[model samples]
Target: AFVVTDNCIKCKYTDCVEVAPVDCFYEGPNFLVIHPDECIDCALCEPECPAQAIFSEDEVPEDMQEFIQLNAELAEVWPNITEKKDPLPDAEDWDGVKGKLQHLER
Candidate 1:
């Protein structure tokens, strides 16, 4: 399964969700998650993220590895988001900001 990482904490870009072949993406206050169990591993959504936050399970960067687990945990509780939506108002400002995990919303 692909994992959505820290860069998505505030950006919450939905391009990934738009291309998802399955309804495996979830939405939160300031983030999105991929339902690891439901993901088909087709890799369709990986490159769609403008923030470049999606990574395959085995390819997850070491520092961002925590996001792989976060995706699963949050997906179970967040609402399903199957269509594209406007990103947070400050998304462009936060796109490449570092250490966004501290600001991740539930």
Candidate 2:
């Protein structure tokens, strides 16, 4: 399954969520997480994240780490997503995301 890493904090796009074959991504206040059970392991979202935050659970890099569990645990409280659609609020004002880590305090 693909995981949304810390890099998605500031650069979320509906396109990323809309393009997933399984629609496994669920939005959080700051980032999104893919349901491990729902993901088809297609690796489609890996190149879509503008912040380049998506990674396989076992392939997450250092520093931008810790998202493997973040993606998994957050799914418990996140709304159930059974559809693959554009971002609910729409994807605007989020172009060119540069500093994803700064969103942690918000």
- Candidate 2 per-residue lDDT, tens place, 41-90, comes to 89877877666778887788776566777777777768755444444242
For model 2, the local distance difference test gives 0.67
TM-score of 1: 0.97
Give lDDT tens digits, candidate 1, residues 47-102: 89999999999999999888888999999999999989888999999999999999
- Give candidates' CA RMSD values in order: 0.7, 3.5
TM-scores of the candidates are: 0.97, 0.72
Off by over 4 Å in 2: 80-102
C-alpha positional error of residue 48 in candidate 1 after TM-score superposition, expressed in Å:
0.5
- C-alpha lDDT (0 to 100) for residue 2 of candidate 1: 90
